[PDB]
Amino acid sequence: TATGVAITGSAPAASMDATLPAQLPISAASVQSTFTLNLKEIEESKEQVT
């Protein structure tokens, strides 16, 4: 703050700016996917498909 006081007066009260936190968590969830392929499927689709 910056207020008005007379020249033969006193000094005004205290004042100081402030900082704040933000904290944005990364600990909880995750994006995933699966395949589930057999072992006969990956053999008879190697001598057939073009």
Among 3, 15, 27, 48, binds other proteins (CB under 8 A): 48
* Count of chain residues binding other proteins (CB under 8 A): 6
- Contact between 37 and 28 (Cβ < 8 Å): no
Contact status: 31 vs other proteins (CB under 8 A)? no
Contact status: 33 vs other proteins (CB under 8 A)? no
**Tokens 């033969």, residue?**
8
Q: CA-CA distance, 15 to 1, in Å (whole number)?
A: 6
Contact status: 43 vs other proteins (CB under 8 A)? no
Contact status: 41 vs other proteins (CB under 8 A)? yes
Q: Report the Cα–Cα distance between both ends of the chain, in Å, rounded.
A: 77
